[PDB]
Design a protein around this ligand. Structure first.
Ligand SMILES: NC(=O)C1=CN([C@@H]2O[C@H](COP(=O)(O)OP(=O)(O)OC[C@H]3O[C@@H](n4cnc5c(N)ncnc54)[C@H](OP(=O)(O)O)[C@@H]3O)[C@@H](O)[C@H]2O)C=CC1
Ligand SMILES: CCc1nc(N)nc(N)c1C#C[C@H](C)c1cc(OC)cc(-c2ccc(C(=O)O)cc2)c1
Length: 159
């Protein structure tokens, strides 16, 4: 089972300028709940965006995709191909834009957080993948953050 997990603005934006363009603690707990104890796979750019205190993400086997055979990352398994990255029975792909696109055909689950923020797409943004009709989805009820942000969770499956 390969799953994708991401948080997006309604527009589809998941990243801009190498960061996630909002703060949503409740989403972080959700992310932790889904991924804990499992292998997580991420692109090198997403690995870089992790704060040092949380790099590698603890309690998870961190796998980082890079075409750089040189690339070093303490606490992470650096691999040069997707095949090398998806060798765990339950694998969660945690970003970013490039790697969601690469892993999407391998995926049978998506766990999506939608953030109700005004954030129209700009050229060069990292974007969420588009889920087509092969997917079946359940839409969660809207929640309000601490904070000021409305958000909701989707669970998507295909067999
Ligand atoms: N909102 C969310 O849920 C999330 C948001 N983000 C955001 O996403 C953005 C980063 O995503 P993105 O810019 O798309 O970059 P990625 O995080 O997807 O990493 C891209 C890198 O992955 C490596 N790579 C890509 N394809 C391959 C391949 N086929 N084989 C081997 N290595 C490969 C390369 O690393 P190299 O260049 O070293 O070869 C490439 O530069 C940031 O803004 C981040 O904050 C990230 C995760 C989740
Ligand atoms: C929490 C954000 C997030 N939400 C969802 N639903 N899917 C995702 N794939 C990511 C993501 C991501 C990137 C890798 C990221 C960036 C970041 O910048 C501060 C922090 C985290 C992060 C995730 C979990 C934990 C934790 O378990 O304590 C800490 C930091 C994770």
């Amino acid at each position: 089972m390969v799953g994708l997990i991401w948080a997006q603005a309604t527009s589809g934006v998941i990243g801009r300028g190498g960061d996630i363009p909002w703060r949503l603690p409740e989403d972080q707990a959700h992310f932790r709940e889904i991924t804990m104890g499992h292998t997580i796979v991420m692109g090198r750019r997403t690995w870089d965006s992790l704060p040092a205190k949380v790099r590698p993400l603890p309690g998870r086997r961190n796998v980082v995709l890079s075409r750089q055979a040189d690339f070093m990352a303490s606490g992470a398994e650096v691999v040069g191909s997707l095949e090398e990255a998806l060798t765990s029975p339950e694998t969660w792909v945690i970003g970013g834009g490039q790697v969601y696109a690469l892993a999407l055909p391998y995926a049978t689950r998506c766990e999506v957080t939608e953030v109700d923020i005004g954030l129209p797409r700009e050229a060069g943004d990292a974007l969420a993948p588009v889920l087509d009709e092969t997917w079946r989805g359940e839409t969660g009820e809207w929640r309000f953050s601490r904070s000021g942000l409305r958000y909701r969770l989707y669970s998507y499956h295909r067999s």
